[PDB]
Design a protein around this ligand. Sequence first.
Ligand SMILES: NC(=O)C1=CN([C@@H]2O[C@H](COP(=O)(O)OP(=O)(O)OC[C@H]3O[C@@H](n4cnc5c(N)ncnc54)[C@H](OP(=O)(O)O)[C@@H]3O)[C@@H](O)[C@H]2O)C=CC1
Ligand SMILES: CCc1nc(N)nc(N)c1-c1ccc(Cl)cc1
Length: 202
Amino acid sequence: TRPKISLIVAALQPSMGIGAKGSLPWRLKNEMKYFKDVTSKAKDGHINAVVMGRKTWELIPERFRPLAGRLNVILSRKNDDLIDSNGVYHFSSFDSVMKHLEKDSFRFKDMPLDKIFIIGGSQIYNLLILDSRVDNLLVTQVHFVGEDADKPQMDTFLDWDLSKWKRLEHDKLEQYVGLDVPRGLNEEGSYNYEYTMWEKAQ
Ligand SMILES: NC(=O)C1=CN([C@@H]2O[C@H](COP(=O)(O)OP(=O)(O)OC[C@H]3O[C@@H](n4cnc5c(N)ncnc54)[C@H](OP(=O)(O)O)[C@@H]3O)[C@@H](O)[C@H]2O)C=CC1
Ligand SMILES: CCc1nc(N)nc(N)c1-c1ccc(Cl)cc1
């Protein structure tokens, strides 16, 4: 873990639902902007990585791919740890891409890496949130404020142990992501949402 490793996720409260019928139930435009900005913000000439499971890669519309200005890592158990002509890292485990990045001195095409973001897959989230190299969680806490009868029926969840983590102050979130970040509850449609940061509670 030379660069710091964040698990970045938007989770419905209180049970941390992250998906429904194979996709994301809410469209929150500013949450999107936050995701883009945080995962993209690096020192001049540096870059961040975004690590995702194959199904999340397939959910991303093709006009976004690879996610611009970031090192794309796709995890598939059939991958052969190859980098393609677009620069995308097709690796078979998080452990194997961490070893490869390390022997590269945590550089991508001569660009130092600043942060490594785990952006996706329930499967990937729930494996890696148990990897001790994960240094923090960037959790957008999403709240449904519409009518009970129209609440999303979440079917996939972040199985995270609250007790193993400690929420940090908003100032610490902003210091880490390198950006001013809206504080408190953001509103869009039937949803309220708040940006939060958590570190290990050892
Ligand atoms: N709310 C949020 O912030 C986010 C929500 N989501 C939601 O998550 C859901 C999709 O997540 P999920 O369906 O779990 O798909 P994932 O994106 O986690 O990718 C799953 C794939 O990852 C690969 N994989 C699984 N375990 C391993 C392993 N141990 N080593 C290497 N590769 C592995 C497999 O590909 P193979 O079979 O080829 O090995 C598997 O099919 C959707 O509902 C989406 O909306 C997604 C991202 C963020
Ligand atoms: C912008 C939504 C979003 N917000 C946050 N805070 N984290 C994420 N990991 C994502 C995300 C969701 C679905 C996909 Cl397919 C990719 C990324």
